[PDB]
Symmetry: D2
Subunit: 462 residues, 4 copies
């Protein structure tokens, strides 16, 4: 019933085949492997468990590897004791990795800390808990004024709002994780902390060098620089993950909502998948139902037009993973059902016209022939009322279309001509149970053209 797709982070509490089967039943479509945690054996077993469930059940799902990414962290403290920092005090960061910290100084993991920052910049420590102002930079030290009281622990994330950070596109561990991704045949790589087009290119070349040229890159937009370069990032990527939580400590709080809406809108126009993620139903880590605010947040992201919504801790380690997935699916179908098409060069003319024709003829189903998935994503751009049945001979395309809104992939032996596509599509339409005898279906394909163009629309009664 629902069209919006659900990404579920799988962890210890949901990794068993029993759980994965019930997760798919409840509406999960894509497994997220979060490589900030776990080791290759845990993630590898999760992949095995899912593909076994898919084989036994005939269910289709996609697998997304989400990188840890490069980051700036504080380091160790004296006797590993927390230190209490006070508004107004001076506090210093050093790039000397040998230093053990105290209430006056701590080391950071990033040698470029002194170069990238300027006097007057803001330094945020521990997911924005403690704010500081840079007052001087001397040698390997960044000297600051603490702006608010807070307890500093060990190895805390550092955020530098509005700063262009010269960290590499990939941490060394990320590069090995991507090779693991290629070994395992993952369908998507979600790359963290993408700031510019060149970051995306480096990831693409790394995957290409290990046989992952057909893996789709989902760039995570987490700070102002990525927002500034969004158009070029999107062009080089296959999709976008809107990381609202990270944006919330990196840009003015009133900008975050319009950053999400703008990024979703541009992804739609580019025919590229977008995932809304972080801080979705987090209260369900501890509670069996979400808050009103969370449900509204999720629903507005769907009304914005997102292809997919993502569960993190709620599904990986929380106490009510199945409840979280089920209420997410309820939110999806309740919100999708009240959304309308948006019908306002060749592919788009044909795909937009195909959706218009389907709407005017009350067709419940658009059947699309596709090799790389573009024709299905081109139809989805207009938010058809009809479900999209996407026929492909490409197993990776079949998996990847699971993430696109309102698309049902079906792997087929092959499609040998335009008329054979019509014959086969009509029977698979009936077999799918998505349409019935007497229903109108619209059938969209590329005839006598290279694989990337969609140029033909045809109307059939089942």
């Amino acid at each position: 019933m629902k069209k919006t797709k659900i990404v579920c982070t799988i962890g210890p509490k949901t990794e068993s085949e029993e759980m994965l089967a019930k997760m798919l039943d409840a509406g999960m479509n894509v497994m997220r492997l979060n490589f900030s945690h776990g080791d290759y054996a845990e993630h590898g077993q999760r992949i095995q468990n899912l593909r076994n469930v898919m084989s036994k059940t005939g269910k289709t799902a996609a697998i997304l590897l989400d990188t840890k990414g490069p980051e700036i962290r504080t380091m160790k403290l004296e006797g590993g004791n927390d230190v209490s920092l006070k508004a107004g005090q001076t506090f210093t960061f050093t790039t000397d990795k040998s230093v053990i910290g105290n209430s006056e100084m701590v080391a950071v993991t990033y040698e470029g800390f002194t170069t990238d920052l300027s006097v007057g910049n803001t330094v945020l420590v521990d997911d924005g808990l403690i704010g500081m102002e840079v007052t001087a930079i001397e040698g390997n030290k960044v000297i600051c004024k603490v702006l608010n009281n807070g307890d500093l622990g060990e190895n805390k994330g550092v955020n530098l709002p509005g700063v262009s950070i010269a960290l590499p596109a990939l941490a060394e561990k990320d590069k090995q994780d991507l090779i693991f991704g290629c070994e395992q045949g993952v369908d998507f790589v979600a790359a963290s902390f993408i700031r510019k087009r060149s970051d995306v290119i480096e990831i693409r070349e790394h995957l290409k060098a290990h046989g992952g040229e057909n893996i789709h890159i989902i760039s995570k937009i987490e700070n102002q620089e990525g927002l500034n370069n969004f158009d070029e990032i999107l062009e080089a990527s296959d999709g976008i993950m809107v990381a609202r939580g990270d944006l919330g400590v990196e840009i003015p709080v009133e900008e975050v909502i319009f950053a999400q809406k703008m990024m979703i809108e541009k992804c739609i126009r580019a025919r590229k998948v977008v995932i809304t993620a972080t801080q979705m139903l987090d209260s369900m880590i501890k509670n069996p139902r979400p808050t009103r605010a969370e449900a509204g947040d999720v629903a507005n992201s769907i009304l914005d037009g997102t292809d997919a919504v993502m569960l993190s801790g709620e599904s990986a380690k929380g106490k009510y993973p199945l409840e979280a997935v089920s209420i997410m699916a309820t939110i999806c179908e309740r919100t999708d059902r009240v959304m309308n098409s948006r019908l306002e060069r060749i592919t788009e003319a044909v795909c937009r016209g195909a959706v218009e024709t389907a709407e005017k003829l009350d067709a419940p189903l658009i059947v699309v022939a596709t090799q790389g998935g573009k024709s299905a994503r081109a139809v989805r751009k207009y938010f058809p009322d009809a479900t999209i049945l996407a026929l492909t001979t490409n197993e990776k395309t079949a998996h990847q279309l699971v993430l696109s809104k309102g698309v049902v992939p079906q792997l087929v032996k092959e499609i040998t001509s335009t008329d054979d596509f019509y014959r086969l599509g009509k029977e698979l339409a009936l077999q799918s149970g998505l349409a019935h005898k007497g229903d109108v279906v619209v059938m969209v394909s590329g005839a006598l053209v290279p694989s990337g163009t969609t140029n033909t629309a045809s109307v059939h009664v089942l």
Copy 2:
């Protein structure tokens, strides 16, 4: 360049192969044979001459047989001299065909004259030259008061505005002429004086009894009864001829223009060809150029949306036939040049969408696969900017489509699948010279459906 099609009545001045070739060059598309005059040997030779020119040139034209039709006429006069009738005098019509007339009485050819008229009806004689009011009907006589002075000659047409006249659908000569039409394999029959649906059916049954089931019937609308019954007449016909001159004697003069505009509009909606005829460029019977009034009348009929315009005496017996055709073509091109598409179940959705797609992509050509001509006529309904190349295996369809606005027919060997249609259509598009390498064409056909449906539209770069 022009899209509006030209019907030319062929007579002694224009029947030679040499003249016919120059007429086609100047813009003639359809030959009208007016069986009000001539004998079978002359009309047969005209048919042969045109088919010879078509063979010699590779040009395609259609042949239309126009019946004389039933009439009411006055008859003979004393010493075959005209008689002067005076306003206010009594004048009498008799159905006794033996009577030789004079200034007080004349015979009419129609026995039902006394039956169909009522006291107070209007009798018009000789193209409305002389008007009379029925004052009494007794026996075989219709006694009238003459309303205006006029000279009555022999054998003059009679018009009875607003009266339902029980003349047969076909005169006995019409039946014979129609069989000749079937023997010769004409493409159209223009049936005179159609007043009701049953008139069309009688024509259809006659043609079908002599192997003319595939001849298209063009019903001529000439009086109020036909206008009252137009919707049923159009439904039973393949097309309509708007006979403006006859309507001008039969209905209130201010209604004629809107009768024309309404009939053209309804024909367009029905995907049925419409011809505007009579009083077009008649002054060119005697003059080498038309009047301003004539040129404007013609142009407004094209802006009304007519498929075709018709020359009568101007091309059959007039002194300047080639001039008349040439200026008609100049008017057509000049008017077609400034007309726009009209873009406002399955066949129409696909054909309307195909036209909109062509426009949005600046396609100079829509290529249509068609057996009966239906798909080509369905596209033309929306007045495409693009020319229509209609590919058919049916020679009769190829000829009949010559009358539809903006259609270039092309006879082909049969196309056995949709992809074969695209392959061949692209080649014939280039071969036609209507599109060139790099142009976009839209290709419309029926896939996996019976002959009555058009369900597939495809966009290709040549």
Copy 3:
């Protein structure tokens, strides 16, 4: 209840008060005085006769003076009779007026003939019957080649398409006629022989020199130069007369149709009255009913959007003046009945919105306050379904609005404020019989602005 206004040329057959009263009854709105004929006593009596009728009846009409203007004509020939000219022969025009002509030469009335013409120009003689090309100019001779066979008679009109002639818009006879017009207080001047903007200015300066500053200038577009300069002519004029017959003598016949349509459209956009004239119902000079062609031409001119249609000979010297007016009114009402509003600066925003509001609320009447007439004409531009009741204290404006489509003028003693306008307008609305208790009316005026702007729209229930 037509909206299109009728201009009737008044002559001996129709100048008496009794005829004029019957003409107004039948639908005449404006009297045209053709100063091509008649003397000041005749025209003066016509003006008095109409003004007596308006006073006696309370009916409102306007008076339009139409100048003869200068002309170039050929002159006399050997003996009384014609000479036949042959295509290809050389033929010469001379500026020596003493010469009696023959098959090789004829004199013309314009001594500047040799100066204004150039080698290669086209000379047309006798309503374009015979065309010639200038091959040489020397002394008192313009040497040409005849382009087509034709018979040249005596004293025939000469046309020089697109050639700038150093003759005034008004000769001395024209200037005196216009002075008479100013003395008599005519409402409109229809100016002959307008070729360019400066011709209009000359008319305006002549009228302003004799107290005619409030007289509206209707520029006649009768030739090629005027068409080329139409935009500047329209801007300087108060309105336009489309003289189809004369324009047809000078430009390609297929262009005349679109010249008419383009000029009417531009006049509408400029909120300036336009009259369609010449060859309207000319056959009714001799016949009590018009031709089908004539009736359709008139109706299409109304659908084009003309404010007014004009009768010439039909009403001035013909046999059936009252019949011509009556059928003209029938054509107007029948065509106006099926026309729709066209809803596509401050005055434009308010007046367009007032019409849209009237349409949305089914108001039968828009009441406008106006001194110069601009607000009523600004509302009429959108072809409201509602009648326009224009209230003015200016008698000249009251007369002039009689020519604007769908406007009923009403002279009132005063309007002292916006609220008093609403009070009075509602009362006069009911008094007019154009609206009734419970009807909605839209009321348009200029508040706290100079007379040139319309800035206020108000909705009232009667």
Copy 4:
């Protein structure tokens, strides 16, 4: 600035004249007095402080009294100690108000508890912390099975999802509080727990009986019954308060978002003010910045079209009231900045047209004459880009309009005619600084009609 209006609950932390002045500076428009807490002397001094600031400063604000309302609560426990309830245990509610409760039974304050509930209904206790299922109803006892573990404290709210509760429209304290509201001349009453049209009518009659007929009633929609009867409730009320927090405990969580969006949309169409309230920036009770989720929730409520957003604890008792108002105003301006007009009977035709005219002419200001406020609210319905300057002689209207989106009220001594309105309105437009010389303004009023119809729009250049 912003157009969305801010309601701030004023409490001990923010009641001083100094704090109120800084609140107005930061964007507060309406003071909410929450009569769940405080006494008449505190609220009375709150009113005095604000009115003194308004007088001294010339700043305008409104005062809204928010009732405590009728409630169902549990009562006391043994030794007033919490008791632990276990999933699966039996637990009983009694309507016997003498009973002191324990881990097996507690009293409720509402005698109708046994009557209104049915076997199988859900009872929720303490903001939905503990759910129970009714298994039996016997005498004064509702016997339930506890559905989840939780500690029950003293005097906790009870919610009965989907039940029609026969509590009175007003608690007895509410009736007294409303008399105080009338005594104090408050501008709005927000009435809690409105379930049906008759509840509103009772409130309306109670205000009318104490001189408060001009106080606007804002009905709070908090449960399913009120949602079911919303259309009748809105019709009888002056506005709506969307109590999201309460709805979250009373209806399926996935419905809450659409309940808000639907109620806002219907209020917009009804030209009636709507406030989005509860769970807006609650985290700012303790933190100086809001969460990303909260800012997005607020912004989406503004994009939904709410007139006003409300602060509760954040501004009444929290630690950072000025910060909360300031970031709220920042969110408002940021969101209002990207919203567009919505241009899709007489008042509505004129006001919709006035907004379209203003937009087409780039007018920064629509000036409205209004006595009851309807014309200002009718213009705001279309979300004009322009500010609305509302001129009124009615002091109560001036204050009430402070709550309507994008309206700036201005009290004037009088306006005696339409022309005087234009003159005065133009000067006050300039005086306000909302427009400047050369700007276009649109001026909207009712001319020659009673209060309550807006029928006049006028365009002026300043």
